[PDB]
Amino acid sequence: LKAWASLSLLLPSRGPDCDYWWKLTGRHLASLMEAAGYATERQYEALVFHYHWMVPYMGPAPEADGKLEWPCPLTVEGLPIEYSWKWNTATKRPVVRYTIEAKNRFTGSSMDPLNQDPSRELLHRLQMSVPGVDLTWFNHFLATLYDQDRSKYAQAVAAGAEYTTSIMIAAELEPNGLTTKTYFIPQKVGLSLSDLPVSSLMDAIAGVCPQSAAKSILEEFLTSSGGNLRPTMLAVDNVKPSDSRLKFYFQSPRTNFKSVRNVMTLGGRVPIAETQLQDLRSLLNASSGLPDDYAEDLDLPLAEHFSPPIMDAREEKTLVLPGFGYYFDIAPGREYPEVKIFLRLTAYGQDDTSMGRGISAWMTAHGRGEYCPRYMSALETLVHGRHLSEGKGVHTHVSCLFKKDGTLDITSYLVPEISSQPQML
Amino acid sequence: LKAWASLSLLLPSRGPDCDYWWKLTGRHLASLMEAAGYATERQYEALVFHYHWMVPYMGPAPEADGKLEWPCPLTVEGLPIEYSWKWNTATKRPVVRYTIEAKNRFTGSSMDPLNQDPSRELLHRLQMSVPGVDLTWFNHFLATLYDQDRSKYAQAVAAGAEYTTSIMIAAELEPNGLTTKTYFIPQKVGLSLSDLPVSSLMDAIAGVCPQSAAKSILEEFLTSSGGNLRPTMLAVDNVKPSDSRLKFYFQSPRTNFKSVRNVMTLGGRVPIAETQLQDLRSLLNASSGLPDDYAEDLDLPLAEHFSPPIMDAREEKTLVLPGFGYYFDIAPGREYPEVKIFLRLTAYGQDDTSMGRGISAWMTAHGRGEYCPRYMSALETLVHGRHLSEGKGVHTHVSCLFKKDGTLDITSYLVPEISSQPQML
């Protein structure tokens, strides 16, 4: 770990909170970056960027009780960070990225009850300092996905409402520099996200994308055989809007593969080659430890010998609820939505070692095994207070999206586990 | 300039003073490091170290009048930084280092009239953060080279005394990591440094080096044919004392080469091969634009068509006074002093281009030309508001020390020139 050892001796100490997150998550990024074959120069830049721009926004260190005043749904322990490992393809090495929730001293207070001001400030300071940052859609969705009179959210909190994370921010450490994305979890003063009609969200979407074939294909799908999908999230890239994706996330209670076929083809409107679909289904069964011929009409079985927090998840906290996550990318000028499916590895599958080996076997079987032993090893540096094989807690999702060349883009979403007394064994 | 372009887009803005010095001197270090063939990884580390540890201690930005409340004798413009270029040998690439004076808001005030507290804090914070920092000799020379009742210096300032820089700090960016050095300019409440007896300084030296052959050889030299040398400075390395050099700097009014022979051999006590001495003399004549056969009995002629601040220099401000600088390294366990001579390129020689080409011709003539065109080019990025050939201001010294293998260790000491209205043309 040359980059991390060097940089962490040259970068000064700064206060207990920054030092906590820098030491905990800076080392994790370095392990993942090293396991993925990142050059030392690329590692230095990412770690330097992490130290100065992300760590200061990660808020307070957790307490001895691994407790935080404003916990984040990215983790069963509520930590404000999630890593992702995009798997190597034929033509590219793995890509390491991560997401944070931005926090400050007023996070969650009556002046900022949905904790949105630190993200505004982080993205604006990045825009003033680094080229190519565009916040048109960021600012538009701030104005339209939420009630605007903050004192309405405060009155409701004064009546027992439990508001949580609304915005998260990602920097991509992809081969060309870095660009940013924003995630919005909509929340209103009087109703649940589950109660939020899709139509209101689509009205907000119509403010920047009034028509597109992809959008029209998705709304036709949603009023037919897509009716069981519940909206959960929206994401944008903070770049020139004509270059930005427009990701509309949904929760589906069903997990049988027949349902997967339905969602990913948008009810047959957007066909997918059967060899690609069968490859996805192989990955889904290998990841959750099911027989390779698991029936296409059967829902996946919930993990149970793991006591996960299923009753604590919802649309606003999608980490641990039964079902699949999806997004539909419906950006303007798209002929059809791009679809990504998210298998929830907190709710399905076995321990982290089995899950990582299931994904590894799939990669190996498809000639992408190049980096699996390094990935398994890096996983072990992410959990503190247990072995990787004793329970769940590092893996949160594995995702698949069918690229325009038939290629399966696969991503492991990973989370630090800190607690000395693990909560899923 | 890949490292500098990358790093200076990832490192945030911080306040006008830090931003001034980072943009001005961070780019200079990058040019010198690039011209010397520094790998990108080494460049990132140095620039990161510069940004966090040195820049914040460089104090206020100069004013529109290129003015500073507490100016530093490193520069005719008083800037608190000097770079050095150690020339390539047969076996090593050039080495880029620099020196700063550490400053804070109380610099020069009645509570810190010799401006020593920022250096204490910088070195202590480095010691707490980076391994191998030892401050035994630093603290010893703080206690013995100065009067200790600060309110005596303040009374004297209340009577028109003009106290100046007392301590400067260097980080070496040598092939193995980085280590630190400290320079002490002694100053007392009632007498000039020129009036400071050598004996009092040697008493301070005896506190950490009570006897050594090198020390004894130097005091025999100084009471015989060395009697015209005036002490100016002491330096230590902030490392384990048994690994530290112990550099005792002197000013000599004479600059004829017969005098050089006398000083560098310590009055014949430490012989030097005649081919090494004649090589030095060639470099001295080439650097100051004199005929190669300049007589060994003639003092060098002062530059004049350059209006330098000769009447403003003294023992405490050795940049521009007639004569040579020397140091004698008399560390314990040394059989004989190591001697380094400093030719003052502010007082002797022609414009910066001629001086740089004189040194370049010498290097080329001795088969060390490898990097001269890159050095000439880097020089041009150091002066603002004039061309390198129109006057003096970048070069401050060129130095030579005879290594234990006959090798001539040669260093160019360089300074940023900022003023739009240059003061030496």
Short mmCIF file of N, CA and C in Angstrom, two decimals, chain A residues 2 6-13 40-42 44-46 48-49 51-53 125 129-131 178, chain B residues 2 6-13 40-42 44-46 48-49 51-53 125 129-131 178:
data_model
loop_
_atom_site.label_atom_id
_atom_site.label_comp_id
_atom_site.label_asym_id
_atom_site.label_seq_id
_atom_site.Cartn_x
_atom_site.Cartn_y
_atom_site.Cartn_z
N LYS A 2 1.65 1.44 -1.07
CA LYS A 2 2.64 2.52 -1.08
C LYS A 2 1.98 3.89 -1.00
N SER A 6 2.65 6.37 2.18
CA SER A 6 3.27 7.66 1.91
C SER A 6 2.34 8.82 2.26
N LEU A 7 1.16 8.87 1.61
CA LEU A 7 0.28 10.02 1.77
C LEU A 7 -0.14 10.21 3.22
N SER A 8 -0.41 9.13 3.94
CA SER A 8 -0.90 9.32 5.29
C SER A 8 0.20 9.69 6.29
N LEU A 9 1.46 9.76 5.86
CA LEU A 9 2.50 10.36 6.69
C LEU A 9 2.76 11.81 6.33
N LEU A 10 2.47 12.20 5.09
CA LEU A 10 2.61 13.58 4.64
C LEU A 10 1.38 14.44 4.89
N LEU A 11 0.19 13.82 5.14
CA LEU A 11 -1.02 14.63 5.29
C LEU A 11 -1.30 14.84 6.76
N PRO A 12 -1.45 16.08 7.21
CA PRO A 12 -1.52 16.33 8.65
C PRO A 12 -2.82 15.84 9.27
N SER A 13 -2.74 15.65 10.58
CA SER A 13 -3.91 15.42 11.40
C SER A 13 -4.75 16.70 11.47
N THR A 40 0.05 4.09 -9.18
CA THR A 40 0.30 4.88 -7.97
C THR A 40 -0.13 6.33 -8.14
N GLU A 41 0.04 6.89 -9.34
CA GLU A 41 -0.36 8.27 -9.58
C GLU A 41 -1.86 8.44 -9.41
N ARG A 42 -2.64 7.50 -9.96
CA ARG A 42 -4.09 7.56 -9.83
C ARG A 42 -4.50 7.41 -8.38
N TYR A 44 -2.75 8.36 -5.72
CA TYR A 44 -2.42 9.59 -5.01
C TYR A 44 -3.51 10.63 -5.22
N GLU A 45 -3.94 10.80 -6.47
CA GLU A 45 -4.96 11.81 -6.79
C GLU A 45 -6.27 11.51 -6.08
N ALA A 46 -6.74 10.26 -6.16
CA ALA A 46 -8.00 9.90 -5.50
C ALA A 46 -7.90 10.11 -4.00
N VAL A 48 -5.83 12.03 -2.31
CA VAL A 48 -5.75 13.46 -2.04
C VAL A 48 -7.12 14.10 -2.18
N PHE A 49 -7.86 13.73 -3.24
CA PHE A 49 -9.21 14.25 -3.40
C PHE A 49 -10.09 13.83 -2.23
N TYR A 51 -9.17 13.12 0.85
CA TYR A 51 -8.77 13.81 2.08
C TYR A 51 -9.35 15.22 2.14
N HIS A 52 -9.28 15.96 1.04
CA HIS A 52 -9.65 17.37 1.08
C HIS A 52 -11.12 17.63 0.84
N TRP A 53 -11.76 16.87 -0.06
CA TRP A 53 -13.10 17.24 -0.50
C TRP A 53 -14.21 16.38 0.09
N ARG A 125 -18.63 24.44 -4.17
CA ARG A 125 -17.19 24.65 -4.02
C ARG A 125 -16.41 23.81 -5.03
N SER A 129 -14.04 25.26 -8.27
CA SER A 129 -12.64 24.87 -8.18
C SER A 129 -12.21 23.91 -9.26
N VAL A 130 -13.11 23.04 -9.73
CA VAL A 130 -12.83 22.04 -10.76
C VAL A 130 -13.74 22.24 -11.97
N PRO A 131 -13.22 22.15 -13.19
CA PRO A 131 -14.05 22.39 -14.39
C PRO A 131 -15.09 21.31 -14.67
N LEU A 178 -12.31 12.85 -12.84
CA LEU A 178 -13.44 12.57 -11.96
C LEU A 178 -14.58 13.55 -12.26
N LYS B 2 2.67 17.88 -15.34
CA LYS B 2 1.49 17.07 -15.04
C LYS B 2 1.15 17.13 -13.55
N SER B 6 -2.39 18.71 -12.25
CA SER B 6 -3.30 17.83 -11.53
C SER B 6 -3.50 18.30 -10.09
N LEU B 7 -2.41 18.37 -9.31
CA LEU B 7 -2.54 18.66 -7.89
C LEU B 7 -3.20 20.00 -7.64
N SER B 8 -2.89 21.01 -8.44
CA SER B 8 -3.44 22.32 -8.15
C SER B 8 -4.90 22.46 -8.58
N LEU B 9 -5.50 21.44 -9.20
CA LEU B 9 -6.94 21.42 -9.40
C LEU B 9 -7.66 20.61 -8.33
N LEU B 10 -6.97 19.65 -7.71
CA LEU B 10 -7.52 18.85 -6.62
C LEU B 10 -7.32 19.48 -5.25
N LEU B 11 -6.39 20.46 -5.10
CA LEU B 11 -6.13 20.99 -3.76
C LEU B 11 -6.90 22.29 -3.58
N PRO B 12 -7.71 22.41 -2.53
CA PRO B 12 -8.62 23.55 -2.45
C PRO B 12 -7.90 24.86 -2.16
N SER B 13 -8.59 25.93 -2.50
CA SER B 13 -8.20 27.27 -2.11
C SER B 13 -8.37 27.42 -0.59
N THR B 40 6.94 11.42 -11.43
CA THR B 40 5.69 12.07 -11.06
C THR B 40 5.30 11.78 -9.61
N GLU B 41 5.60 10.56 -9.13
CA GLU B 41 5.27 10.21 -7.75
C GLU B 41 6.04 11.09 -6.77
N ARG B 42 7.33 11.29 -7.04
CA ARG B 42 8.14 12.13 -6.17
C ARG B 42 7.65 13.57 -6.21
N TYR B 44 4.53 14.57 -6.72
CA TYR B 44 3.27 14.66 -5.97
C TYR B 44 3.54 14.78 -4.48
N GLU B 45 4.44 13.94 -3.97
CA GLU B 45 4.74 13.95 -2.54
C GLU B 45 5.33 15.29 -2.10
N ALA B 46 6.33 15.79 -2.84
CA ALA B 46 6.93 17.08 -2.49
C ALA B 46 5.90 18.20 -2.52
N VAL B 48 2.62 18.00 -2.33
CA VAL B 48 1.68 17.79 -1.24
C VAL B 48 2.29 18.22 0.08
N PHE B 49 3.55 17.85 0.32
CA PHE B 49 4.23 18.29 1.53
C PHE B 49 4.34 19.81 1.56
N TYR B 51 2.36 22.02 0.14
CA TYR B 51 1.05 22.63 0.35
C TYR B 51 0.66 22.61 1.81
N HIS B 52 0.85 21.49 2.49
CA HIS B 52 0.33 21.35 3.84
C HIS B 52 1.27 21.84 4.92
N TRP B 53 2.57 21.64 4.77
CA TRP B 53 3.49 21.89 5.88
C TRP B 53 4.30 23.17 5.76
N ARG B 125 5.36 19.90 15.28
CA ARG B 125 4.24 19.22 14.61
C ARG B 125 4.76 18.21 13.59
N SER B 129 4.36 13.96 13.76
CA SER B 129 3.62 13.42 12.63
C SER B 129 4.48 12.56 11.72
N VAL B 130 5.76 12.87 11.58
CA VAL B 130 6.69 12.16 10.71
C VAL B 130 7.86 11.59 11.52
N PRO B 131 8.27 10.34 11.28
CA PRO B 131 9.36 9.74 12.07
C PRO B 131 10.74 10.33 11.82
N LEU B 178 12.33 12.59 3.15
CA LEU B 178 12.69 13.96 3.48
C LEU B 178 13.07 14.05 4.96
#
